[model samples]
Target: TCPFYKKIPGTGFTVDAFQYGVVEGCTAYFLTHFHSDHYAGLSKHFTFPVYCSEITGNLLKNKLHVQEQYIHPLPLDTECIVNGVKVVLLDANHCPGAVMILFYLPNGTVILHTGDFRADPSMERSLLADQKVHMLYLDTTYCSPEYTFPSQQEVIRFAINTAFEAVTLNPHALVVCGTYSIGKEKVFLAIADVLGSKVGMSQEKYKTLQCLNIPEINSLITTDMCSSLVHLLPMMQINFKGLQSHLKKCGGKYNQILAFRPTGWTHSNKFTRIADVIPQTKGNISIYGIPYSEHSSYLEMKRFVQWLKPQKIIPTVNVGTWKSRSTMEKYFREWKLEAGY
Candidate 1:
């Protein structure tokens, strides 16, 4: 029923993005990212031991103001321990500090908690993808046949190139990018480098970037609304009206607007054989929805589950309790993938 769990709390404990009180019963926790859904009930006063990446630990300490003594930051592609279970943090390719928590239990059962990760074959295929996982906690946000979309790199390239085209078409227009609290910094960073412009954002988003300590991204942050720079707007809610509100915030300084959103929802509609998704633009703000999702798609999930051959699958999204396992089993049995790259 709860978003996070552990069958036996003390022996081989592992938790992901749990609430403040949830980690109190466990010895340690593995945080995936700074996403609100994952870090639901976390705050400045957390006192439990948490294992995460270096950047994630900094965010917890500086932004969330959690004490440093309780935070245990781990490096990527390495092994550590939480209680008795051997733990490792793998690249999730979702956000800057996002990771997939892998656990090797004492009973020889390997468990993987993919905390909001996009399936990238290059990441862990040769190393850990083939591991015989006993239980898999999957991020099944797009676990359906209709949700297939391009890779994050492909979509990022598409977004940057399209935004460039839009800007060239209307040099006076302010390009607005709808992004989340943590991801899509790569898009803005690339845009800034290409266009020789800074990205305008709120103080909160800027602080989040500042903690990353990346010079390329940190340098791109600006508060100047009237500058001919790309604008990084908050997009906690992804909708037409929400996008319109962001465009309005930029004011009447530019000629016309070109807005773009990178999400998997753009591919939700049925596609004809010849109707592969391309960028769409319309109105005062020519909006383009680029497919750059953080979670694994249906095809990706199928391939991954087959590769790992987990005895049981526990999804991290939707439903509750014992019902979750049954739903996962049914979905896994139904979603079949034909062989191809």
Candidate 2:
């Protein structure tokens, strides 16, 4: 994360933090993002104070029900010292509230923890999380050499186009995806600008857009923000509260919802409870998933190790099992590196 507010990444991608880490004393535990996987561990483990962006802290206290005393706010590009630890909250450009945390100690051993991040040499594509670094705990979800994703802008475009096609055919339908607050909002906003495509984005989704607040960051592109062609089209109202009930009987008269099929949508047995609800639209429309992500791709992990130039590269997630550890091992071992984990 760059020098900025303690940006909060949507930590809900994997799980709850409370189930994972413990907050022990003297050892300051910094949450790199607001995602459940990142922040959910708060109040469970680690007895020390928690640091995060002002916006993120608010979300935690008011929304996520995290305690206030446990939180220390860090404004964008600001630095704070906790128990003599210089904890910096930096911009990680991944999602709205996303951040990377850097912990500086007296021992000269600086630990850089990145929940998820991305970057390019020219700095064209970035998570806003990269800056100065020492030992790096990189996000290596896509650590294989084969995962190459397009730019964020490009993915947004494709998703919007696909959404428009789906909604135009039936505006009264429900569009569902296997995502939570932040990342889901981007596609919804793009569809807002498209003609004949109305989206009912969730309340949480709407709030995340406001959190971003930067017009240049592509916050809210009103239907008026685009050409009149997108305005005259139909729209679908998103319902967060009543979604599950309607999703239960998907093929009814409300067969209009387009679902963004999960990773293994084809296998009903393997698909999770949520994915079972997301089904093929029978050629009606699409809840498109462009494979865009806040986490690094396989090749990006390899390249990141080369750039960070660390003594030992360690990788971790809520549970560093096969989903993450394998990739961590691949990158470190493939590069002839070492890891304590």
Candidate 3:
């Protein structure tokens, strides 16, 4: 069992606990985002009422075929009462429809659960800045100092420039961008807009993108594979062998392939600077691992923790072992002390 599944103590509510089954004594189940790791184990058989952002609710219905009655799509920055607890939703900045949940208990305790988010300056200006959060369920995906990387905008700009240069030199080269079903849309969208190339994706992924309600995407994606020079594929398919096979299947339409595997994991403390992160090549296929992450960087997490100074902090990710969990907590302590709390 994942340690993160443990229900919030003193309340009959569970956040992203579907995989744990109907958690004992939990009447309300909350989903922070539509990511598989977060929404895993949720099925049509689920009985408890699920609370989530409107976008996430649409995904649950269309992707998982979840029943509508059990789904409650809450509006952003608005308060709603759930089981007598005051609840509010804030933009998580992680994915489409993702929200950080805020719970105000009847006993006057304030709990903030960031499902998974990239901490932004706008978050500090939210209502959370004014409230005293007793317990903060943080998305500690990049909690370690070694995981620091450039901002999303910076990485996206780098990717666009790299792709543009590659194609400008080799006009027949096909550009492939790896992405998940929901997140990382910004990276590829910018590439398409700047390159003035149509995006090619599977019918299923195109349908999933439709739920996001991004009007600009309509003119960019196409069903015809040969008609597009830019292809959007699953992250797993960006490897050397995969690209080789993809190039073979393309016949004579494209001479070479330039692929991007965009993720935060691509960066590390080992690299002296962002520019030091380079691409790997095999034959006619070159793969660039761009540091494009949707999660908060180490410094961003530090800033958020310092500003909030929550009475208690919980690591939602990377908490499988006691040592790892405690190390993260130690960082939290240091950040809190720096905040003069």
Candidate 4:
């Protein structure tokens, strides 16, 4: 059977489906975060009411130029009724404005849509966890067993320590950490705090960070390029060619470059230890691919399913191919059977 991943199973609400351009029975549109993949096709011309967290709402208005009248910002953890459906937004733990939506339908059906999340153990303490969810829309980003990497904390520590070593070796080196438009703020922010270094970014990115309302952001970030040794750049700019171009732009102020590209895809079971993950070096530049994922690992996903024990699961990712979808479903079935569901 083909999966309609865009719309909720038994509701008129369409989630992260703006690219479809006004889905046929979708009465309300919900966005989980400010990420481009989720908020694609949304523009100033959008007519449907868009529901999201306050931070995401601000990003939509400021960054995308989405009109104010069509935007609806929902507070986190607060229960609210929208079009007669009870809805609540929970912290997704993926990014600054990300959320996992909980829906209490009028027909007594409960649904949880995990837009994109890193399964943290603390999520088990939520009062919503007590609910017997009938259907779960899961983020199956890393649903395969081989994708199981270490916890976020471990990877973060490794990144910080690795960067520290690099900085210690070359004090005058330019430290550049790659990130997305909205995620991975923690990695760069922590690096700056620990090293007592100033952060540099483009004016446009700084404005987006301001929408996040991070407490230390204002003091930590500087637009003056030469004032800070550590800079935040887009993920694409972490490569050798890109770094070479960026270094030339620096005009010999820095002798070497220490860059980190933090993401889950860099991890593998082959690496017995975190330190085993090596960096690729060329000339005076070194780039490390840190396994600092914002999405849940395979084991983490299994644990979350065991705890929630949702009656049915619908994957929101890796659904384009039948083989991939079935592989994820197989894992879900095994987990469900083990949990006695």
Candidate 5:
């Protein structure tokens, strides 16, 4: 909220603009999380300090083209006062850096804004029940029963099985399994779990798996301590001929892994086509579509409201643009919502 404008040769109520924008003359603005919509107009227009999780802050600074000082980053579970308004950022766990915000205003109104999160992983249902939620800016994209996704552990098993199957059947055939820089990288560790030390892996994979903090993954590495694996580092260094050579010599667990990452970030199609020339690579590669996604599906959205049991669920998507709440409610009910939030 901005300060009320006054005595400036304008329709003057005297107060600085940003100060007036504050809720009941409190803070002008506070961001719930760092999803694209939540941060579309950041730095350029909403240049004021925006609150976010520390992970999100690092991502925004390193990945997004934005200014540094504008981010007011905080810890995952810690609560802080931003200009008399209490703000607590908790892990959303939908995406690695996503968070749910609890805004406690002095006027006694409490707002809960979830930025693309799944509550199951973190087990935050107790908090939802304990807190008095007056308003909820819920994510309703996946609010229906129709939408379904695999769990993280399931994804790990799938990727590892997919990769190892390629390795087992082809016998030293190079395997290309794709992944995004961060998220898919975690998936890679899961693949490595099936591979074991009999299936050697790279140092980068080691570090990322460590960062994932799944300690059980370490023992999963087999006794053979695989000498036959060349993990795809990144797309920037990818080359068709180079990949062909790696795939051609897959002997034992020492064969290379070609990760075909179909994540939001992109890569060239030619890379996928390179195996065509090499006969060994034909059946050696595997394409896996492990239930990977960032946005909530219809069921996911419904789960958010169902989990919270909120009084009124306010959407933060295209449904918000609907002219009438009834129209939105109609779709919401169709999606199995108790009623439109």
Candidate 6:
């Protein structure tokens, strides 16, 4: 009946998200990522240990206040065992510390669980070395054909360039880039590097970024709002109509405020396209939605599924369980053997 948690048959193990308060029947638990949906009810008093990347393990301790001993940090690309089944953690290319779990049972059953991830060529190549995959647990957030977006790197470049252009036009203007609590660190760090300015963050966001242990990132974060020309604001603060009101309030202090939101939802229609820079100027504020996302698009999902060559596909999205079945059947006709291991 649980949506997120899945039982690995024959192994007697389970994986869950924020599925707290129920830890009796599972042999071991693995968290695919740190997103709230994935970490549903995790808290200080969570009884059982959960396996994840070292970065996620740090967040569980510092952010969730989970005990250190109970936090199991799995090394990326390294083999570890759970209930006698070999497991490897591969980069999910979604958000910080997100990974696709690979399980290799002694009976030769192989399972791949993509918590939430984007299609990365490097990651796919790493797994294409002649291995048999029995099942693939996919992340189908954008399962519909209408959802298609640009590559993350391309979108980040556009966002950084947009910030630079805005700063060039208004040298003293306050540039605010909106982002979620965890993802989109690249947006701020890249902007800071180009502008030679410190990135301003709220107190909590500063702590979350600090746990990443990135040297360049540490220098970019500042609590003082006025310490830099650009501020990394939270995504919730930059609503469609709400941002217009916010800009009016800042007119007295900042000569100008340029806002941008980096998300895959930037492109969702009959066409799969991305602008050089899409601008939304309502009244006074200029807010842009850069075509960026952490999840795979419909095309990317198909290509990735083709590479795995699994006996069956298990989609993470609730509706995707049925929706993806026909979708894959229509799109993924030629499951090439050369692409799979």
What would the per-residue lDDT of candidate 2 be over residues 1-341, giving only the tens digit for each residue? 12111221222112113444442222344555667655654542234466667767666665666667777678765567766556666666566666766666566666666666664443222322454445666665556555555555765666566667666776555555444545434554565556343334344554544455446433333323122222111113223333434444443545455545223112232333322233333344434334556666555555656665666555554233665565556667657544332
Tell me the tens digit of each residue's lDDT in model 3 across 30-78: 8999999889998777777999988888888888889999999999898
* Candidate 5 Cα RMSD (Å): 9.3
Q: Candidate 4, after superposition: displacement of residue 303 in Å? A: 0.6
- Evaluated at residue 188, the lDDT of candidate 2 is 49
**lDDT tens per residue, model 4, 182-211:** 888878887877788778999998899989
**Candidate 5: 10-residue stretch with minimal lDDT:** 5-14
- Candidate rank order under lDDT: 4, 3, 6, 1, 5, 2
Error of 2 at 217 (Å): 12
Q: Write the per-residue lDDT of candidate 5 for residues 161-232, one digit (tens) a residue.
A: 666777677555554444335444455545555655323445654444343333575564322323534254
- lDDT of candidate 2 at residue 221, scale 0 to 100: 33
**Considering only N, C-alpha and C atoms within 3 Å, which residue pairs clash in candidate 3?**
none
Query: CA lDDT of each candidate?
Result: 0.70, 0.50, 0.84, 0.86, 0.51, 0.75
User: What clash count does candidate 2 reach?
Assistant: 44
Candidate 1, 178: how far from true, in Å?
A: 1.6
Tell me the lDDT of model 4 at 66: 96
> What digit string (tens of lDDT, one per residue) describes model 6 on residues 1-341?
45533766666566664464564467677887778877878888887768889999989999999988789898898889876778998988888888888888888888888888887667767754558788888777877777777777777777777778888887867778887758767877887888888988788988888887576676777987766777877788876576656556555666566787776674443453555455777655677777667888878887777766778766667444565567655554545444553
Model 6 segments beyond 4 Å from truth? 127-130, 240-251, 267-273, 320-341
Better model by lDDT: candidate 1 vs candidate 5: 1
| Model 6 TM-score, 2 decimals | 0.89
